[PDB]
Write a protein that binds this DNA or RNA. Structure first.
Ligand SMILES: [K+]
Ligand SMILES: [K+]
Ligand SMILES: [Mg+2]
Ligand SMILES: [Mg+2]
Ligand SMILES: [Mg+2]
Ligand SMILES: [Mg+2]
Ligand SMILES: [Mg+2]
Ligand SMILES: [Mg+2]
Ligand SMILES: [Mg+2]
Lengths: 167, 200, 118, 131, 122
RNA sequence: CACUAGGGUAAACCCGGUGACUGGGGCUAAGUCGUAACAAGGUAGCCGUACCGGAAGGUGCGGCUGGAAA
RNA sequence: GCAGUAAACGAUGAUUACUAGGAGUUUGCCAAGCUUCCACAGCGAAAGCGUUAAGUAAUCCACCUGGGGAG
RNA sequence: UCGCGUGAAGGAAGACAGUCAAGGAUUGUAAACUUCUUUUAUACGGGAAUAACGGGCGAACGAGUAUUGCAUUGAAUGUACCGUAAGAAACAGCAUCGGCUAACUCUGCCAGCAGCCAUACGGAGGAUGCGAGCGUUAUCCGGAUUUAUUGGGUUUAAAGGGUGCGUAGGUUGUUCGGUAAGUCAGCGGUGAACCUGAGCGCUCAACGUUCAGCCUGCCGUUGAAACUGC
RNA sequence: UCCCAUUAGCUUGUUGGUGAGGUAACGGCUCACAAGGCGACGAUGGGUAGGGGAACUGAGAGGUUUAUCCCCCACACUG
């Protein structure tokens, strides 16, 4: 279902953004074991966007592993100009997101994980709402799947078999 | 109210000498206080947006309520919000006087405007926040055309090279052609950060 | 009785009047039957806006104007018997030509020389 | 049965989700009009009306994109249910998927889509959303 | 619920309650101190907090926490009571306004003077 | 002479207060007596009902697994 | 003859239509009408449900809105 | 609530405070030169006031013209001249969220939360918000979808009645023909101030005012017949 | 055009008629046959409140209040 993309050696414009840092714990007989998990979103300011989770014992190592995983896992999103073709709602775990296209001079009306995802994908005119949990993993995944479920008018006409649906 | 504090502190804090040219900015490029030039602790994106807003405010001599109202005006107006905000900031009467070169600094222009040495369309206007429109004429008052400070400031300002300002030395006046584009405005303020800070 | 009068509607130090048709018992700035114009006495030409047809109709049905409202009506030319003429017709008063009387009186401008030779 | 139109939409939706190529529905006049609208707008591959001893059968052949193995129809939603009827004027006609979908609406001029309903300036009952 | 169920019954909304009900929506109140005593905080905190039992003008008993370093409050002292609850202290949901009526400002203060009613030093 | 505000009378109702004495509840510390539940918590636990005990509780009858072991 | 309660439980209200596979099993002729376990899509926070749905939809009823106080 | 001032341009690294011999306060101060918004003193000084009443002029009473007097506010707007940086800055933060740092003290305390008895308590030096204001308390609204028509749920988180029958009520397979209650459409009436684009006047602005764009409810009257109702 | 069913029956000029009187005016408005009227689409009773336009607030739906302003109502120590 996802468009997917090979390692973008040519499309090396992938800027990496950090969503959240967490210090998870594991218990053993000796004591407690501490690690670090980072959520990293790589984007080329175009429909290409990837997400990754990097786990390590140190923050730079976790961020690097997240960058690597995000680079490995890439998809393409059908974005026209700085907006989205239509509205779209998505759910992933306890997180629910809703995106609506806005006017050209509106900016991005979102904050946090959704704002990071939208910046990485290169959408600059959208109203975004979160109606579920604020979990970073689920918010990032729900926003990405909302973007992936979109369809431009050309694709709509293509799978409908017609040319102009009075658009 | 006015800032009326030391200026080299703000110049050193922001790096750019926004108040003109000074001999202090060299050999001293640290924010004021005993904790200056001790590396640079990671400032957040919110801190950077705040520092950009403060840079604009200290540059144009505008307090926070007036700045917020200017942002509201730019948002209501048609065009790019940041470009409109910078145009509105540059369209103030004291800034227009400073760009015309009647006074050396923006604060000097504000003092002249307040002390009523500036006429707009032949009438004395003394509100420094007065919004100058294109087509208007801003000139020295006839009773103060021989001020030593004004004469010194105009001495060496034979350039008057600003494209959106037409200077007439015979009448000791000037006119505004149009609102300049943000790229034409010579200010290092990143209006995008201020826009997102004020809209979020 | 029904009256033609002014309601004070500007602000402190700047009076702007709304010429209305109102019952005499109504409050000064309160209920009114109809609005027929406006009056700005701050401008030297003494700005007046008036609905001629409605003002004439109210005068015809018998609204009694106050002193200033009557002066405004006379200045605008509502107070006439040209319609009262039972023995003549098409009696163009043409008094608007004389009532124009454009008072373009201005003031000479003088300047003080700046002899600051120092 | 409580809502034959909702049942028709549900049959189509379940056939699409299961991946079937042909779906058979009991026939009705309004259902035949809806099938005609769907064929005209290009959401279904074909249809056929069979008149047996019962009320009849509508046989619908669905349209799949061989390029992407994706059906032409993505969402079918019933709007005006028996428990809550919805009527709109031509000025307040809904727009589905920002104009990329259709809204089947019954108007005094017949059963049509929101586009021609707006063009002819007639309102009515919003049957369903399709995209 | 169904649309018919909502038509029959509908939805219910409940108004909230004031965090400081003894003020009766007044920003402050006047009161008289019954007993000026000392109290112990909860488990993770150790101190000797200064509290007063105050009888408000609306005939209500409140426990008001006296802030700042030292106070001159005694029994039968007219004080001003405002809102605000201390976390560790249970049942103390009011504050005494220093520098008003009988209670005076905190001596020796230089910072946060307006919160403790201390005049600007000469 | 009717009509009626107001007055007296009685009742009964409703709304409040106080009262010798006599009962729960919440919160804070921890004095005293035990160990009921959490592991098969050392008698699997819980639901209903009845009787009985300084208290947690115990027992009878039916039910449940939101129980091991088998 | 009263009483009207339960872990009165599938802790899952009643109708209607539709949507994969396996393994068993009762009944009248491959096939209903049942009755039990894995398990696609889909659903779900997960454990899990999955044609006897907790899936896809429509109609009507019951009930919930932090814990204690308090049934 | 809006606007303005508390000075403008030059001036090296004084004295005193803080930190470590050197950072910082700091071009800050002290000096020297311009300006007088605004205070102070003097003078000129509007507009808000237009009709009046009393004279006329076309004539049979109404109007149309020309004059006198009329300002509480009021030495208020505005204007002009003396000589003067002179008369004019505080309040709350500074461990994370959050913009801002080190020394000296030490239960006293602080506190929105994480909590702290010191990058959190008190003072000192600095820095950061704002600014004639700055903080605290009270009240209301939004995020809060925490009453969910738009727009939530009920196996185990709160939540399916012990199970049926059944009254009112709610919903109603397919088709033909009427009707026009719901529904749709056209026309007409009705609906100060405030609020939205454009101006105009307040030296700007708050504000005042004019005009275009809202009337998107209600009522009356003509048509349509796909759907619901009969 | 607000809550309470831990308020379910209320009503005897009360519902209609004939006539008369009275009023600016129609009318059980008042006065001299029939038994009707209102009620789970909430009568009756109890509690609370002056009502709108404004204003504020929110993307909207909506929510809060009617301080100043305008309209309507009620009142002038208590009857
Ligand atoms: K059982
Ligand atoms: K039907
Ligand atoms: Mg035990
Ligand atoms: Mg046991
Ligand atoms: Mg025993
Ligand atoms: Mg139960
Ligand atoms: Mg101010
Ligand atoms: Mg439960
Ligand atoms: Mg059951």
């Amino acid at each position: 279902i996802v468009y997917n993309r090979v390692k973008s050696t040519n499309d090396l414009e992938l800027k990496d953004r950090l969503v959240a840092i967490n210090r998870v714990t594991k218990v053993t007989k000796g004591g407690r074991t501490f690690t670090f998990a980072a959520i990293v979103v790589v984007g080329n300011e175009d429909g290409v966007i990837g997400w990754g989770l990097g786990k390590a014992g140190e923050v730079p190592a976790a961020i690097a592993k997240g960058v690597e995983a995000a680079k490995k896992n890439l998809i393409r999103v059908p974005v026209h100009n700085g907006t989205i073709p239509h509205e779209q709602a998505a759910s992933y775990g306890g997180a629910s997101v809703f995106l609506k296209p806005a006017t050209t001079g509106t900016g991005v009306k979102a904050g946090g994980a959704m704002r990071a995802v939208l910046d990485s994908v290169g959408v600059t005119d959208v109203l975004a709402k979160s109606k579920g949990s604020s979990n970073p993993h689920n918010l990032v995944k729900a926003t990405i799947q909302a973007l992936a479920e979109m369809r431009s008018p050309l694709m709509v006409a293509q799978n409908r078999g017609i040319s102009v649906e009075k658009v | 109210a006015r800032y009326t504090g030391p200026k080299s502190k703000i110049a050193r804090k922001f790096g750019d000498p926004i108040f003109g040219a000074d001999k202090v900015l060299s050999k001293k490029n640290y924010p004021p206080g005993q904790h200056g030039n001790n590396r640079r602790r990671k400032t957040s994106e919110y801190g950077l947006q705040l520092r950009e807003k403060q840079k604009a405010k200290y540059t144009y001599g505008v307090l926070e309520k007036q700045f917020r109202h200017l942002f509201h005006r730019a948002q209501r107006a048609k065009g790019v919000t940041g470009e409109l905000l910078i145009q509105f900031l540059e369209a103030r009467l004291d800034n227009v006087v400073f760009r015309l070169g009647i006074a050396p600094t923006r604060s000097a222009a504000r003092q002249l405007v307040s002390h009523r040495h500036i006429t707009v369309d032949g009438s004395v206007v003394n509100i420094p926040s007065y919004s100058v429109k294109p087509g208007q004429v801003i000139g020295v008052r006839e009773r103060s055309k021989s001020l030593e400070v004004i004469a010194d400031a105009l001495t060496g300002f034979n350039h008057s090279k600003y494209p959106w300002m037409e200077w007439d030395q015979s009448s000791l006046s000037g006119k505004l052609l149009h609102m300049p584009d943000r790229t034409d405005i010579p200010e290092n303020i990143k209006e995008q950060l201020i826009v997102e800070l004020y809209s979020k | 009785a029904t009256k033609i009068r002014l309601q004070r509607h500007g602000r402190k130090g700047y009076a702007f009047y709304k010429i209305v048709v109102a019952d005499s018992r109504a409050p000064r700035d309160g209920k009114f039957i109809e609005r027929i114009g406006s009056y700005n006495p701050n401008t030297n030409p003494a700005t007046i806006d008036l609905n001629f047809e409605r003002a004439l109709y109210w005068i015809g049905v018998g609204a009694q104007p106050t002193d200033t409202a009557r002066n405004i009506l006379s200045r605008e030319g509502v107070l006439m018997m040209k319609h009262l003429l039972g023995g003549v017709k098409k009696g163009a008063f043409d008094q608007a030509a004389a009532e124009n009387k454009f008072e373009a009186w201005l003031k000479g401008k003088k300047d003080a020389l700046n002899n600051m030779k120092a | 049965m409580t809502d034959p139109i909702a049942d028709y939409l549900t049959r189509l939706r379940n056939a699409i989700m299961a991946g079937h190529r042909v779906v058979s529905v009991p026939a009705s006049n309004i259902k035949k009009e809806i099938t005609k609208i769907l064929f005209d707008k290009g959401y279904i591959l074909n249809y056929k009306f069979e008149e047996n001893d019962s009320q009849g059968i509508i046989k619908v052949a669905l349209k799949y994109d061989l390029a992407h193995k994706v059906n032409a129809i993505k969402k079918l939603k019933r709007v005006s249910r028996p428990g809550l009827r919805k009527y709109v004027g031509y000025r307040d006609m809904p727009r589905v998927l920002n104009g990329l979908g259709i809204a089947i609406v019954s108007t005094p001029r017949g059963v049509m889509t929101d586009k021609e309903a707006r063009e002819l300036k007639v309102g009515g009952e919003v049957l369903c959303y399709v995209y | 619920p169904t649309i018919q169920q909502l038509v029959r019954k509908g939805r219910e909304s409940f108004a909230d309650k004031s965090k400081s009900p003894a003020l009766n929506s007044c920003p402050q109140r006047r009161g008289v101190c019954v007993r000026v005593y000392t109290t112990t905080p909860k488990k993770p905190n150790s101190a000797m907090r200064k509290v007063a039992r105050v009888r408000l003008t609306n005939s209500k008993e409140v426990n008001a926490y006296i802030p700042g370093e030292g106070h001159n409050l005694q029994e039968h002292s007219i004080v001003l009571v405002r809102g605000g609850r201390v976390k560790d202290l249970p049942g103390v949901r009011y504050h005494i306004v220093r520098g008003t009526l009988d209670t005076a400002g905190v001596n020796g203060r230089t910072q946060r003077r307006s919160k403790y009613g201390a005049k600007r030093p000469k």
